[PDB]
Coordinates of C-alpha atoms and ligand atoms in Angstrom, one line a residue:
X1 CA 11.0 -56.0 64.1
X2 CA 11.3 -52.7 66.0
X3 CA 13.9 -52.1 68.3
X4 CA 17.6 -50.0 68.3
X5 CA 20.9 -50.9 66.3
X6 CA 23.0 -52.9 67.9
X7 CA 27.3 -54.5 66.9
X8 CA 27.2 -58.2 68.0
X9 CA 30.8 -60.4 66.9
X10 CA 30.9 -63.4 65.7
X11 CA 32.5 -66.6 64.1
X12 CA 31.5 -67.5 60.3
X13 CA 32.0 -70.8 58.5
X14 CA 35.6 -70.1 57.9
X15 CA 36.6 -68.8 61.8
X16 CA 37.3 -66.3 61.1
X17 CA 35.9 -63.3 63.8
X18 CA 33.5 -60.3 62.2
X19 CA 31.5 -57.8 63.3
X20 CA 27.6 -58.1 62.4
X21 CA 24.9 -55.4 63.4
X22 CA 22.1 -56.6 64.8
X23 CA 18.5 -55.3 66.2
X24 CA 18.4 -55.3 70.0
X25 CA 14.2 -55.9 71.0
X26 CA 14.3 -58.5 74.4
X27 CA 17.0 -60.9 72.1
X28 CA 19.2 -59.6 69.6
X29 CA 18.2 -60.3 66.5
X30 CA 20.2 -60.7 62.4
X31 CA 18.3 -57.3 61.2
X32 CA 21.3 -54.6 60.3
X33 CA 19.2 -50.9 60.1
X34 CA 22.9 -49.4 58.4
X35 CA 21.9 -50.0 55.2
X36 CA 18.7 -49.6 52.5
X37 CA 15.9 -50.8 54.5
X38 CA 17.5 -53.7 56.2
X39 CA 19.5 -56.9 56.3
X40 CA 17.9 -60.2 57.8
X41 CA 18.3 -63.0 58.5
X42 CA 16.7 -65.9 58.9
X43 CA 17.0 -70.2 60.3
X44 CA 15.8 -72.2 58.5
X45 CA 16.5 -74.9 61.3
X46 CA 17.1 -77.7 58.2
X47 CA 13.7 -78.0 56.8
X48 CA 12.6 -76.1 54.1
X49 CA 9.5 -73.4 54.7
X50 CA 10.8 -70.2 54.3
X51 CA 12.1 -68.2 55.8
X52 CA 11.9 -69.6 58.5
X53 CA 12.4 -67.3 62.0
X54 CA 14.0 -64.0 62.0
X55 CA 17.3 -65.3 63.2
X56 CA 17.1 -64.6 67.9
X57 CA 20.6 -64.8 69.8
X58 CA 20.2 -64.4 74.1
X59 CA 23.8 -62.4 74.0
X60 CA 24.8 -61.0 70.8
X61 CA 27.5 -63.0 70.3
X62 CA 27.7 -65.5 68.1
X63 CA 30.6 -67.8 68.0
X64 CA 28.6 -71.8 67.8
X65 CA 28.7 -73.1 65.6
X66 CA 25.1 -73.2 64.7
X67 CA 25.1 -69.9 64.2
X68 CA 28.3 -69.3 61.8
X69 CA 26.4 -69.8 58.0
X70 CA 24.4 -67.1 59.6
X71 CA 27.2 -64.8 60.1
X72 CA 28.5 -64.7 57.5
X73 CA 25.5 -64.5 54.8
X74 CA 24.4 -61.2 57.1
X75 CA 28.1 -59.9 56.8
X76 CA 28.5 -60.7 53.7
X77 CA 25.5 -59.4 52.1
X78 CA 26.1 -56.2 53.9
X79 CA 29.9 -56.4 51.6
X80 CA 27.4 -56.8 49.1
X81 CA 25.3 -54.3 49.3
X82 CA 27.7 -51.7 49.9
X83 CA 29.6 -52.9 46.9
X84 CA 26.5 -51.9 45.0
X85 CA 25.9 -48.5 46.7
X86 CA 29.8 -47.2 46.2
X87 CA 31.0 -48.7 43.0
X88 CA 27.8 -48.8 40.7
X89 CA 25.1 -46.1 42.4
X90 CA 23.0 -48.6 43.2
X91 CA 20.4 -48.8 46.5
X92 CA 19.9 -52.4 46.9
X93 CA 18.7 -54.7 44.2
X94 CA 15.9 -53.7 43.4
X95 CA 17.3 -49.7 43.5
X96 CA 15.5 -48.4 45.8
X97 CA 16.8 -50.1 49.2
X98 CA 14.5 -53.0 49.3
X99 CA 14.9 -55.5 52.3
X100 CA 17.7 -57.8 52.0
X101 CA 16.8 -61.6 53.5
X102 CA 18.5 -64.5 53.3
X103 CA 18.1 -67.5 55.2
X104 CA 21.2 -70.2 56.1
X105 CA 20.3 -74.0 57.7
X106 CA 18.1 -74.7 54.3
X107 CA 16.7 -78.4 54.0
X108 CA 19.3 -81.0 55.2
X109 CA 22.5 -81.9 53.5
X110 CA 22.2 -79.0 51.0
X111 CA 24.3 -78.7 48.5
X112 CA 23.1 -75.4 46.7
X113 CA 22.0 -71.7 47.1
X114 CA 19.9 -69.8 45.8
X115 CA 17.3 -66.7 45.1
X116 CA 14.1 -68.1 45.3
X117 CA 12.5 -64.8 43.1
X118 CA 12.0 -63.5 46.7
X119 CA 15.0 -63.4 48.8
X120 CA 18.4 -65.8 49.2
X121 CA 18.8 -69.2 50.7
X122 CA 22.3 -71.4 51.9
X123 CA 22.4 -75.2 52.2
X124 CA 24.9 -76.4 54.1
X125 CA 25.9 -78.5 52.9
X126 CA 27.1 -82.4 53.2
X127 CA 30.2 -81.3 54.4
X128 CA 32.0 -82.7 51.5
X129 CA 30.9 -81.6 48.5
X130 CA 30.5 -78.1 50.8
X131 CA 30.1 -76.4 53.7
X132 CA 27.3 -74.2 54.1
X133 CA 27.5 -72.2 51.3
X134 CA 27.0 -68.5 53.1
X135 CA 30.8 -68.7 54.0
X136 CA 32.1 -67.9 50.7
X137 CA 31.2 -63.6 49.3
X138 CA 31.5 -65.3 45.7
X139 CA 28.9 -66.9 46.3
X140 CA 26.6 -64.9 48.5
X141 CA 27.5 -62.5 45.7
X142 CA 26.7 -64.3 43.1
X143 CA 22.9 -65.1 44.7
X144 CA 22.0 -61.8 45.5
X145 CA 23.0 -60.6 42.3
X146 CA 20.8 -62.8 40.3
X147 CA 18.0 -60.3 42.5
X148 CA 19.6 -57.7 40.4
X149 CA 19.0 -59.5 37.4
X150 CA 15.5 -60.0 37.5
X151 CA 15.1 -56.4 38.4
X152 CA 16.9 -55.1 35.6
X153 CA 17.6 -56.5 31.9
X154 CA 15.5 -59.7 33.5
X155 CA 17.1 -62.6 31.9
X156 CA 15.2 -65.9 31.7
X157 CA 17.0 -68.1 32.8
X158 CA 17.4 -71.0 30.5
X159 CA 19.6 -71.6 27.2
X160 CA 21.2 -68.5 26.3
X161 CA 19.6 -65.8 28.0
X162 CA 20.0 -68.1 31.2
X163 CA 23.9 -68.8 30.7
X164 CA 24.1 -64.7 30.7
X165 CA 22.1 -64.7 33.8
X166 CA 24.8 -66.8 35.5
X167 CA 27.9 -65.0 34.3
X168 CA 26.3 -62.2 35.4
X169 CA 25.9 -63.4 38.7
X170 CA 29.4 -64.8 38.9
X171 CA 31.1 -62.1 36.8
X172 CA 29.8 -59.7 39.9
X173 CA 30.0 -62.6 42.9
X174 CA 34.0 -62.2 41.7
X175 CA 33.9 -58.4 41.8
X176 CA 32.1 -58.1 45.2
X177 CA 34.5 -60.6 46.1
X178 CA 37.5 -58.8 44.9
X179 CA 35.8 -55.1 46.6
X180 CA 36.0 -56.9 50.1
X181 CA 40.0 -58.0 48.7
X182 CA 40.5 -61.5 51.6
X183 CA 42.0 -63.8 48.5
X184 CA 40.7 -63.0 46.4
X185 CA 40.2 -64.8 42.6
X186 CA 38.9 -65.3 39.4
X187 CA 37.3 -69.0 40.5
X188 CA 33.8 -68.8 41.5
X189 CA 33.0 -71.3 45.5
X190 CA 36.6 -72.1 46.0
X191 CA 35.8 -71.8 49.7
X192 CA 33.4 -73.9 50.6
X193 CA 33.7 -76.3 47.9
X194 CA 35.8 -79.7 49.4
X195 CA 36.8 -79.1 52.6
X196 CA 39.3 -82.4 51.8
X197 CA 40.5 -81.4 47.9
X198 CA 42.4 -78.1 48.0
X199 CA 42.8 -75.6 45.2
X200 CA 39.5 -76.7 43.5
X201 CA 36.2 -74.3 43.3
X202 CA 32.6 -75.0 41.0
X203 CA 33.6 -73.1 38.5
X204 CA 37.0 -71.2 36.7
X205 CA 36.3 -68.0 35.2
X206 CA 39.9 -67.8 34.1
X207 CA 40.0 -71.0 32.8
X208 CA 36.7 -72.3 32.5
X209 CA 37.5 -75.8 30.8
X210 CA 39.6 -76.6 34.5
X211 CA 36.2 -78.0 35.7
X212 CA 34.6 -79.2 32.1
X213 CA 32.5 -76.1 31.1
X214 CA 33.3 -74.2 27.5
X215 CA 35.4 -71.6 26.7
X216 CA 34.9 -70.7 22.8
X217 CA 31.3 -70.3 21.5
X218 CA 32.2 -73.6 19.3
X219 CA 32.0 -75.4 22.3
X220 CA 28.3 -74.9 23.8
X221 CA 26.6 -77.4 25.2
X222 CA 22.9 -76.9 23.4
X223 CA 21.3 -80.1 25.8
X224 CA 18.5 -79.7 27.9
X225 CA 20.0 -80.8 31.5
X226 CA 20.5 -77.3 33.9
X227 CA 18.0 -75.9 31.8
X228 CA 20.5 -75.5 29.1
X229 CA 23.3 -75.4 29.8
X230 CA 22.9 -71.7 32.6
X231 CA 26.3 -73.2 34.5
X232 CA 27.5 -74.4 31.3
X233 CA 28.1 -72.1 28.6
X234 CA 28.3 -69.3 31.3
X235 CA 32.3 -70.3 31.5
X236 CA 31.9 -69.0 27.6
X237 CA 30.9 -65.3 28.8
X238 CA 32.7 -65.9 32.3
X239 CA 36.1 -65.8 29.8
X240 CA 35.5 -63.1 28.1
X241 CA 34.3 -61.1 31.4
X242 CA 38.3 -62.1 32.5
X243 CA 39.9 -61.8 29.3
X244 CA 38.3 -57.8 29.1
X245 CA 39.7 -57.5 32.4
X246 CA 43.4 -59.0 32.9
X247 CA 44.2 -59.5 28.8
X248 CA 45.4 -62.9 27.4
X249 CA 45.7 -64.6 24.2
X250 CA 42.9 -67.6 23.9
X251 CA 42.6 -69.7 20.7
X252 CA 45.3 -67.1 19.1
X253 CA 43.1 -64.2 20.3
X254 CA 45.2 -61.4 21.8
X255 CA 43.1 -58.9 24.4
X256 CA 44.4 -56.0 25.7
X257 CA 42.9 -56.3 29.6
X258 CA 41.4 -53.1 30.8
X259 CA 40.8 -53.8 34.8
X260 CA 37.9 -54.8 36.4
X261 CA 36.9 -51.4 37.7
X262 CA 36.2 -51.3 34.1
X263 CA 34.9 -54.5 33.4
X264 CA 32.0 -53.9 36.3
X265 CA 31.1 -50.5 34.9
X266 CA 30.9 -51.8 31.2
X267 CA 28.8 -55.1 32.3
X268 CA 26.9 -53.1 34.7
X269 CA 25.8 -50.8 32.2
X270 CA 25.0 -53.2 29.9
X271 CA 22.7 -54.7 32.4
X272 CA 21.0 -52.3 33.5
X273 CA 20.3 -50.4 30.1
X274 CA 21.0 -52.6 27.0
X275 CA 20.1 -56.1 28.0
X276 CA 17.1 -57.5 27.8
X277 CA 14.7 -61.1 29.1
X278 CA 15.3 -62.5 26.0
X279 CA 18.9 -61.5 24.7
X280 CA 21.4 -64.4 23.8
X281 CA 25.4 -64.1 23.5
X282 CA 25.7 -61.6 20.3
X283 CA 22.9 -59.0 21.8
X284 CA 25.1 -58.7 24.8
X285 CA 28.3 -58.9 23.1
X286 CA 26.2 -55.9 21.1
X287 CA 25.2 -54.5 24.2
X288 CA 28.3 -54.4 25.7
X289 CA 29.9 -53.1 23.1
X290 CA 27.6 -50.3 23.2
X291 CA 27.8 -49.6 26.9
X292 CA 31.5 -49.4 26.3
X293 CA 31.5 -46.9 23.6
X294 CA 29.0 -44.7 26.6
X295 CA 31.0 -44.4 29.1
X296 CA 34.5 -44.8 26.9
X297 CA 34.2 -43.3 23.4
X298 CA 34.1 -45.6 20.0
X299 CA 37.9 -44.8 19.4
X300 CA 38.8 -46.1 23.0
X301 CA 40.9 -49.2 24.0
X302 CA 37.8 -50.5 25.9
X303 CA 35.3 -50.8 23.0
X304 CA 38.6 -52.8 21.4
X305 CA 39.6 -54.8 24.4
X306 CA 34.9 -55.6 24.2
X307 CA 35.3 -56.5 20.5
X308 CA 38.7 -58.4 20.9
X309 CA 37.3 -60.7 24.3
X310 CA 34.3 -61.5 22.3
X311 CA 35.9 -62.5 19.3
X312 CA 38.8 -64.9 21.6
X313 CA 35.0 -67.4 22.4
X314 CA 33.6 -67.5 19.6
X315 CA 30.8 -64.6 19.7
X316 CA 29.8 -62.6 16.4
Ligands
79F401 C1 26.6 -77.4 42.7 C2 25.9 -76.2 42.8 C3 26.5 -75.0 43.8 C4 26.3 -75.6 41.0 C5 25.3 -74.7 40.8 N1 24.7 -73.7 41.4 C6 25.2 -73.0 41.4 O1 26.3 -72.6 40.5 C7 24.8 -71.3 42.4 C8 25.7 -71.1 43.4 O2 26.2 -70.5 43.6 N2 23.5 -71.6 42.7 P1 22.4 -70.5 41.6 O3 23.2 -70.2 40.0 O4 21.6 -69.3 41.8 C9 21.5 -71.9 41.9 C10 16.4 -72.2 39.6 C11 15.9 -71.2 40.5 C12 15.3 -71.5 42.2 C13 14.4 -71.0 42.4 C14 13.6 -70.2 41.8 C15 14.0 -70.2 40.4 C16 14.9 -70.7 40.0 C17 23.9 -75.8 39.9 O5 22.5 -75.3 40.7 O6 23.6 -76.4 39.6
CA402 CA1 25.1 -66.6 71.4
CA403 CA1 39.3 -66.3 46.8
CA404 CA1 36.6 -66.8 44.2
CA405 CA1 37.5 -77.3 47.8
ZN406 ZN1 23.5 -68.8 39.7

């Protein structure tokens, strides 16, 4: 909408207060004009029609329970935009400052979030399996990263290419969580998953097997559930990424860690220069090796660590 840029205040899903960029024109709208061609947050009103209505508020204060998912979707989309711009020199998901759109209050009791090809969509959860999923910065960044992938490598959402697609979203979701630097970890979705159970999460990158996911290529799933295991086999790549950054010895193979910033540089370059819609795990290894070679040199520790990490997870 046309209006003037304003700054509202509200509370997110986890009860924390934050400022949000809004737009005033009769109402205050969840429209942040400070980033690219805008960040826009919509109310889906418990229905499944998308996007719903651009979020309108009479007083620029967003402290109602109903407001909390919208506050966080809007704010964490801004953090994710900032990460891609400041760290990777990428302007929004398309590299040309496309408007970022999210809808909250999607459906009833909806235990998921997704990118629908055009926008982010967040369920509220059923209150037992999840609370509203936009409360997780890693979840928000996971979703926006699907848009980045779709505009760049274009990894098809099934089998190995789809597991790479998923791992890219978990990797960058985690790197955005570390960028914001509030309780960062190598777990996925811990802030919004199972409010009645402490210490769990959807997935673990440091130890995928904790939540049943493979941590070695010999344990990959090749059935048909979950688009050929895209959220399952992602564990093999998530583990490799964790090892590149943090190091460790896994199935007897030792990896010297090189840190998160270099992990992100290597995988961002692989995603945007070398991967294609059909890349498999072996081709990801080759893309990561080439990316590290470009950035750090063929004799570098960084290249050596990429090779050891993929060796450790059984990907040649
Ligand atoms: C329990 C559930 C949340 C775990 C899992 N979800 C996640 O792990 C994440 C949560 O951030 N959501 P996502 O991977 O984006 C889906 C698919 C699709 C949708 C629209 C168009 C084209 C294709 C799943 O979907 O199984
Ligand atoms: Ca209000
Ligand atoms: Ca965390
Ligand atoms: Ca996390
Ligand atoms: Ca929990
Ligand atoms: Zn995903």
